[PDB]
């Protein structure tokens, strides 16, 4: 079920001015781009979080520490 | 400490529907805190890492997003790891991404390595959902079981000498790599100072030094501050993560630093493709993208 | 309390290698706890039940086994349910077993009924297995919110006024059915005395009237014994379990006893069956077998 | 579900039903279902210890007797200042089961200048580990494994 056939896309283009000593390379070859789940497949959305309800609950556990 | 039944157990939900929990034991739980701070704790705060190396971005507890990684990335030992923190809040599922990543690091730990993010924080998971689904899914003792160990998670890596790695960015206050070395674990991250500024500050085109961070937190710092921390040091790269970006990685300052971004479609609210950045052993960086599909 | 999503996960593990674990929540768990108990208080600790009836004895955590019981009696509420006792200790699944009980005593009830067995007892499960699993897979302080539960159990049943159910079996000081009616929960189960005997005594062919049992605990009585009582009160049968028996059932005193035991090669070292005796209507008394294939 | 089941002989005619029994054995064939084998079922335990069990519990009705308080201690490079002993039931108690009290108080030490623990007193449980019931060594690497504020529960009678 994980979708193993990556497609290919443009890589990263050639650079024209490469700092002088630099060690690391950046590749020019084709970027792999792997399918993962759409938002239909895996729901991301998280209704149960509340900052604003957890900061009055924390202030209090403070104010009792 | 069974690790490699906690690994099946958290496993064995491949080729599920996203969103089935795996329940493990609150004493197999604290067990992954107790022996992956011990880890942290006799490891560098600031990690010395050689490529290759796989660098992941944000994950905030989208778990199969995080299978997704390693399914295509390779799984740990086959690849080298490293994470750039943000593991909890938010997602759902922060206890399985955040027990999964502590199993690896206890079982592979010379291969596998998760820096601090700003969320690896108590008062910042205390409210943006971590301490609910840990009050919810256990209990409270396991939430302040789960800070003594964020409180000893490295803060910075080195990879070859070139890459410089960590969740948030550079402080105006650093000047040398020893004031990162000389921090002492556990700790908090404060409100400002050195380690508030790794682990919140952004990068920004607009701001030519150093700028005021909309978040109310930290700073923000330009393409000129990143050429001089650079040259300063010795350095080719900054690798960081922290900000959303549309194709899951995104260069600034020419590309003297990238942002890395591992969860895609965050949160239900951005279209943004994940990705990953690997380092051969030549020092030869590339792009892998996970773009969820239509 | 979430009861069908906690029914729903408690039976996905059908089809399952046995020995596979569901773990809920400890608040999932706990919720159980209290709103069985609240249950078990409003109903008499001497049941008064009706035709058509199921009825099983020990469990002892054996989940796999007890769900192929409901699988071949028919899941509640196809089916009304009395158990003897003993679902807790020996067993690897008394977590499982206990909760799957409790779920379908809530969901159903006027239709399904637990017993007290000589094991729902914190003096016992403290050392025959049930603390043990509960602190590995929860903590000490789930295990005494259970026997806050198992301290409101029922004690006994009589079915249609004319069969008596308890876990052990008679006591020498047993007299008046209002001696049961009147004992106050939450108790404990004392070293001595009638409650002791209820949940303890067993039926012995050697003994005359009331003997020593082997146990160290309660006593032993014979078949004299049983006729006596039975005619006293006007009773056709008792039903109790709390022995290993070979064919999962097993008649004393001509059919005036019968011992059920329900947790088929019991602990794996002992090759028995399980039985459950159905009750019709009519009082038709009929034993249905749960044999370990070869 | 597993629903084909054999048939054994049923219960016997009885020769004297008692005159005015109202409940009735049947004496048809009694069916017979099909659960797990031994090979596929393992209902073996082998982590039931009764004898290990009955020490730990004796230590625990012991600590519900007693006046139970959280006390936390910034640990620091002198450590907690604290050195435990292991105490447990009778003259042949073992090393295995064990209550963990307080033997000494560091001077200057991080205990000492909280002030609230004292000799004598029983360490309950540290960072949500019980130390009731556990070999010295268990306690000893529990609290050398200790790192920042510790959290404590502390009895005393
Ligand atoms: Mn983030
Ligand atoms: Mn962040
Ligand atoms: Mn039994
Ligand atoms: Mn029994």
């Known amino acids: 079920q994980p979708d193993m056939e990556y497609s290919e896309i443009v890589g990263l283009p050639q650079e024209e001015e490469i700092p002088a000593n630099r060690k690391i390379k950046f590749s020019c070859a084709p970027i792999k781009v792997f399918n993962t789940y759409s938002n239909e497949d895996y729901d991301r959305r998280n209704d149960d979080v509340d900052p604003v309800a957890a900061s009055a609950e924390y202030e209090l556990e403070k104010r009792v520490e | 400490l069974n690790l490699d039944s906690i690994i099946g157990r958290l496993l064995e939900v491949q080729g599920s529907r996203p969103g089935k929990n795996v329940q493990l034991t609150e004493n197999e739980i604290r067990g992954l805190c107790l022996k992956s701070r011990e880890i942290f704790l006799s490891?560098?705060?600031?990690?010395?890492?050689?490529?290759?190396?796989?660098?992941?971005?944000?994950?905030?507890?989208?778990?199969?997003?995080?299978?997704?990684?390693?399914?295509?990335?390779?799984?740990?030992?086959?690849?080298?790891?490293?994470?750039?923190?943000?593991y909890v809040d938010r997602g759902k599922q922060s206890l399985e991404t955040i027990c999964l990543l502590l199993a690896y690091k206890?079982?592979?730990?010379?291969?596998?390595?998760?820096?601090?993010?700003?969320?690896?924080?108590?008062?910042?998971?205390?409210?943006?959902?971590?301490?609910?689904?840990?009050?919810?899914?256990?209990?409270?003792?396991?939430?302040?079981?789960?800070?003594?160990?964020?409180?000893?998670?490295?803060?910075?890596?080195?990879?070859?000498?070139?890459?410089?790695?960590?969740?948030?960015?550079?402080?105006?206050?650093?000047?040398?790599?020893?004031?990162?070395?000389?921090?002492?674990?556990?700790?908090?991250?404060?409100?400002?100072?050195?380690?508030?500024?790794?682990?919140?500050?952004?990068?920004?085109?607009?701001?030519?030094?150093?700028?005021?961070?909309?978040?109310?937190?930290?700073?923000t710092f330009g393409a000129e501050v990143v050429a001089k921390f650079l040259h300063k040091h010795?350095?080719?790269?900054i690798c960081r993560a922290h900000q959303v970006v549309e194709d899951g990685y995104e260069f600034f300052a020419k590309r003297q630093l990238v942002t890395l971004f591992s969860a895609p479609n965050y949160c239900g609210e951005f279209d943004n493709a994940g990705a990953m950045m690997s380092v051969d052993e030549t020092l030869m960086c590339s792009f892998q993208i996970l773009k969820p599909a239509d």
Request: hydrophobic letters at 35%; charged letters at 25%.
């Open chain 2, 43 to 86: 490891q560098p705060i600031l990690l010395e890492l050689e490529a290759p190396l796989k660098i992941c971005g944000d994950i905030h507890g989208q778990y199969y997003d995080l299978l997704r990684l390693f399914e295509y990335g390779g799984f740990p030992p086959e690849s080298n790891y490293l994470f750039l923190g943000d």
């Open chain 2, 106 to 219: 206890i079982k592979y730990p010379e291969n596998f390595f998760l820096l601090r993010g700003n969320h690896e924080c108590a008062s910042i998971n205390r409210i943006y959902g971590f301490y609910d689904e840990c009050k919810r899914r256990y209990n409270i003792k396991l939430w302040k079981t789960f800070t003594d160990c964020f409180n000893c998670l490295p803060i910075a890596a080195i990879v070859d000498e070139k890459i410089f790695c960590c969740h948030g960015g550079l402080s105006p206050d650093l000047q040398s790599m020893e004031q990162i070395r000389r921090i002492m674990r556990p700790t908090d991250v404060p409100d400002q100072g050195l380690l508030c500024d790794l682990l919140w500050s952004d990068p920004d085109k607009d701001v030519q030094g150093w700028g005021e961070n909309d978040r109310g937190v930290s700073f």
């Open chain 2, 234 to 237: 010795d350095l080719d790269l």
